[PDB]
Paper text:
Amide synthases catalyze the formation of macrolactam rings from aniline-containing polyketide-derived seco-acids as found in the important class of ansamycin antibiotics. A key enzyme is the amide synthase ShGdmF (hereafter abbreviated as GdmF), which is not part of the PKS and is thought to catalyze the release of the ketide chain from the acyl carrier protein (ACP) domain of the last module 7 of the polyketide synthase. The overall folding of GdmF largely resembles the common architecture of its NAT analog, revealing a three-domain architecture with an N-terminal α-helical bundle (domain I, residues 1–88), a β-barrel (domain II, residues 89–185), and a C-terminal α/β-lid (domain III, residues 211–257), the latter being connected to domain II via an interdomain region (residues 186–210). The catalytic triad (Cys73-His111-Asp126 in GdmF) is highly conserved with an rmsd of 0.04 Å compared to the catalytic domain of MlNAT1 and is buried deep in the large active site cleft between domains II and III.
Crystals of ligand-free enzyme GdmF grew in rhombohedral form and diffracted to a resolution of 1.4 Å. Despite the low sequence identity of < 36%, the structural homology to prokaryotic and eukaryotic NATs is quite high for the refined GdmF structure with root mean square deviations (rmsd) of 1.5 Å for all backbone atoms compared to the structure of MlNAT1. As has been previously observed for prokaryotic NATs, and in contrast to eukaryotic NATs25, the C-terminal α/β-lid terminates in an α-helix positioned away from the deep active site cleft. The low crystallographic B-factors of the β-barrel and α/β-lid indicate fairly rigid domains with average values of 24 Å2. However, differences in the amino acid composition and their sidechain positions, particularly in residues 72 and 74, are found in close proximity to the catalytically important cysteine 73. This leads to a two- to threefold increased active site cleft with a volume of approximately 700 Å3 in GdmF. Despite the high resolution of the crystallographic data, there is no apparent electron density found for a major part of the interdomain region (residues 194–206), suggesting a highly flexible, mostly unstructured loop. In NAT structures, the interdomain region has a largely α-helical structure and closes the deep active site cleft and the catalytic triad. This altered loop region in GdmF appears to be a unique feature of amide synthases and contributes significantly to the widened active site cleft. Given that the native seco-substrate of GdmF is much larger, the wider active site cleft and flexible interdomain region may play a critical role in substrate binding and/or catalysis during macrolactamization.
Residue numbers in the entry: 0 to 193, 207 to 257
The structure:
C-alpha cells in the first residue's frame, strides 16, 4: 500500500510517534533490526529491468516489507528507513559503502546503501539493512571507541574513506565496510543504480545470521558459529530469523 508511518511503526513494534531525539533514533534502529529481517531470497524478483532504483516504486517495497511482513536487502530496508526517519523529522543523508570481503579486500565502491543522520550537532550512522554482524544501534561518526551489547565499534579514517570496524569479545578489530562521508546526499536514493542466501536479524542482546549453512550468533559480545547439517534444524533457524522479535 502507500507508505504510512503509523503502519510502519506498528510493524516494528514502536508505540505512538516518538519525538525526534537521539533516544528515539536508537530505539527505532534497534526495533527495526529486531522486527524486519534481512533476506535476499526473493530480491531478484523485485529488480527493475532498467537497473535504476527509482523504477522500483517505494510502495512496492513498503508492501512487501511492511504490509506483508517479509524481509529485504539493503536498498529496500535502508530506503524505507530513510523515508521513515525523514517523515519523523530527522536530517537523513544517503551514503554508499564498499563491503569488506572474506579475502580482506573491499568490494564494489557503492554496493552497500545506508544512511547518516545529523542531529544536534553530531552525525550518526544508521544501517538497518546489512546482513552480517554489525551495529544494532546507531554509531557516532568518530574514531572514538563505542560499545554496545558487548561489542566495540569505531569509525576510522583511511585513504579518504571512513571505515566501520567491529571488535567482539576475544577477537581483533575487523572492518565491516568503508565509505566516503562527503558523498552523502539527502536525495541519494534517487541516484542508486542496481546464489547464496543471506538472512539475519537482531535479538535483544545481539544478532543471529544465516549465510548458506553458516549460522552465526552473538549474545552480549560472545560469538558462536555452527555449519548446519540437518534439514529440520536449518528450517528451524530460518523460521526463527524470519519470525522477528
Amino acid at each position: 500500500h502507500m507508505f504510512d508511518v503509523a503502519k510502519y511503526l506498528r510493524r516494528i513494534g514502536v508505540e505512538g510517534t516518538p519525538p525526534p531525539t537521539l533516544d528515539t533514533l536508537r530505539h527505532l534502529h534497534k526495533r527495526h533490526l529486531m522486527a524486519v529481517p534481512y533476506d535476499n531470497s526473493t530480491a531478484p524478483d523485485r529488480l527493475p529491468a532498467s537497473r535504476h532504483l527509482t523504477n522500483v516504486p517505494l510502495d512496492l517495497v513498503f508492501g512487501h516489507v511492511v504490509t506483508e511482513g517479509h524481509g529485504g536487502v539493503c536498498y529496500e530496508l535502508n530506503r524505507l528507513f530513510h523515508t521513515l526517519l525523514a517523515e519523523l523529522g530527522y536530517d537523513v543523508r544517503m551514503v554508499a559503502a564498499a563491503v569488506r570481503q572474506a579475502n580482506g579486500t573491499f568490494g564494489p565502491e557503492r554496493e552497500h546503501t545506508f544512511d547518516l543522520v545529523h542531529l544536534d550537532g553530531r552525525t550518526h550512522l544508521v544501517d538497518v539493512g546489512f546482513p552480517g554482524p554489525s551495529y544494532s544501534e546507531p554509531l557516532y561518526l568518530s574514531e572514538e571507541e563505542q560499545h554496545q551489547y558487548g561489542c566495540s565499534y569505531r569509525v576510522t579514517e583511511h585513504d579518504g574513506y571512513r571505515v566501520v570496524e567491529r571488535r567482539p569479545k576475544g577477537s581483533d578489530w575487523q572492518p565491516v565496510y568503508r565509505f566516503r562521508p562527503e558523498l552523502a546526499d539527502p536525495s541519494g536514493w534517487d541516484a542508486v543504480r542496481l546464489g547464496t542466501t543471506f538472512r539475519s536479524r537482531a535479538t535483544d542482546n545481539g544478532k543471529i545470521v544465516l549465510i548458506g549453512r553458516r549460522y552465526f550468533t552473538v549474545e552480549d559480545g560472545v560469538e558462536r558459529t555452527k555449519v548446519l547439517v540437518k534439514a529440520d534444524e536449518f528450517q528451524d533457524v530460518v523460521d526463527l530469523i524470519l519470525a522477528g522479535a
